[PDB]
């Protein structure tokens, strides 16, 4: 999971 | 927004769509390319091809279970492009590049047409 | 094999599937979550959820046009997860995390359940 | 395009  | 994003989600979805295609699950159309038949999902074809996007948004063609392609379309070229639609992987070879590019132009798959043009240019 | 791969292909496909969902094109099921209704594509739901994968491979349920979820399922939690299925983006907030995690457990979306567990653990 |  990432900060887009 | 403040959303978080799962990096592999799109790839995992496409992988499962290809698994459903391989097991012939919820396929809703057969693409006829001369003597050859290819089962697929209309939504995936539309998501990958300007030609299929136009066909399946048509108020009569949207309901057809069989689509016949132009007789000049090569079945192997179509097969390679259908595999690409469902995997992101393109089996581009010296022996098939001309058929793949012509099929990609007909299907309106601009990124494929682009890499075919570049691979051909390098060999000239 | 000796295939080449188009990096953005899976993301571009998912983007177009979400555009077809937004315009209600070739959607083939309505998911009922108490008073709320959500239109979707069975193939995308199966590709994202262990629960929908089981439902739509069932020889009778595969043909249903309406699926009613358990009455304990929160419509907003479902909406957030349906948006995630079609975009890879999850709108996870303090005010919705409990409903999102419970809905993800029911829908069998293990990566979502995992990030919810981790976000909850950090707040304890 | 890349070599996967
Ligand atoms: O080279 C390409 C690949 C492609 C796909 C589609 N598909 C869609 N485009 C916009 N909205 C929607 Cl809803 C879809 Cl399905 C249309 C044109 C092209 N051209
Ligand atoms: O957390 C998750 C996400 C998910 C999706 C699916 N889907 C599929 N899996 C295998 N082959 C096929 Cl054909 C599909 Cl459609 C099944 C289980 C789970 N669990
Ligand atoms: Cl393309
Ligand atoms: Cl997930």
């Amino acid at each position: 999971w990432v900060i887009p | 927004d403040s959303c978080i994003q799962f990096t592999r989600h799109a790839s995992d979805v496409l992988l499962n769509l290809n698994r459903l295609r391989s097991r012939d699950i919820l396929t809703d159309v057969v693409i006829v390319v001369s003597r050859e038949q290819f089962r697929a999902h209309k939504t995936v074809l539309m998501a990958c091809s300007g030609l299929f996007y136009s066909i399946f948004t048509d108020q009569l063609k949207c309901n057809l279970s069989v689509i016949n392609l132009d007789p000049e379309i090569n079945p192997e070229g179509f097969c390679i492009l259908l595999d690409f639609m469902y995997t992101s992987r393109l089996n581009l070879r010296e022996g098939n590049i001309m058929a793949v590019m012509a099929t990609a132009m007909y299907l309106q798959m601009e990124h494929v047409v682009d890499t075919c043009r570049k691979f051909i240019k390098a060999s000239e």
Side-chain angles (χ1 to χ4, degrees), chain A, chain B residues 1-58 60-92 94-120 122-124:
Chain A
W1 294 83
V2 303
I3 302 303
Chain B
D1 220 299
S2 59
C3 287
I4 55 174
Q5 198 223 347
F6 191 70
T7 304
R8 297 290 299 161
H9 184 73
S11 179
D12 286 354
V13 166
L14 197 66
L15 182 73
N16 284 335
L17 292 178
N18 197 32
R19 284 161 175 176
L20 295 171
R21 179 179 66 123
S22 72
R23 298 158 55 189
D24 198 36
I25 298 163
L26 285 173
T27 51
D28 58 358
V29 77
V30 67
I31 307 305
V32 182
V33 192
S34 292
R35 290 188 184 267
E36 308 295 315
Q37 291 182 9
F38 301 88
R39 292 206 51 88
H41 303 99
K42 284 175 188 178
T43 57
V44 176
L45 296 182
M46 295 164 88
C48 297
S49 156
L51 186 71
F52 290 126
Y53 175 52
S54 290
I55 292 165
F56 302 121
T57 54
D58 177 86
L60 287 172
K61 298 184 191 77
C62 64
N63 293 136
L64 294 175
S65 63
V66 179
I67 299 298
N68 300 300
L69 304 192
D70 185 293
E72 283 255 59
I73 304 304
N74 178 255
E76 189 193 27
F78 185 77
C79 185
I80 286 157
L81 289 173
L82 186 59
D83 282 343
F84 167 75
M85 293 186 197
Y86 279 87
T87 62
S88 310
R89 287 147 194 261
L90 186 72
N91 183 25
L92 195 56
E94 186 184 41
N96 69 31
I97 189 154
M98 298 312 287
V100 172
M101 185 173 73
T103 312
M105 288 169 70
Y106 169 78
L107 295 183
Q108 301 166 33
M109 295 172 70
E110 313 315 339
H111 294 302
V112 175
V113 176
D114 185 56
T115 197
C116 285
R117 286 221 247 265
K118 281 172 169 69
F119 275 47
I120 290 160
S123 276
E124 289 176 355

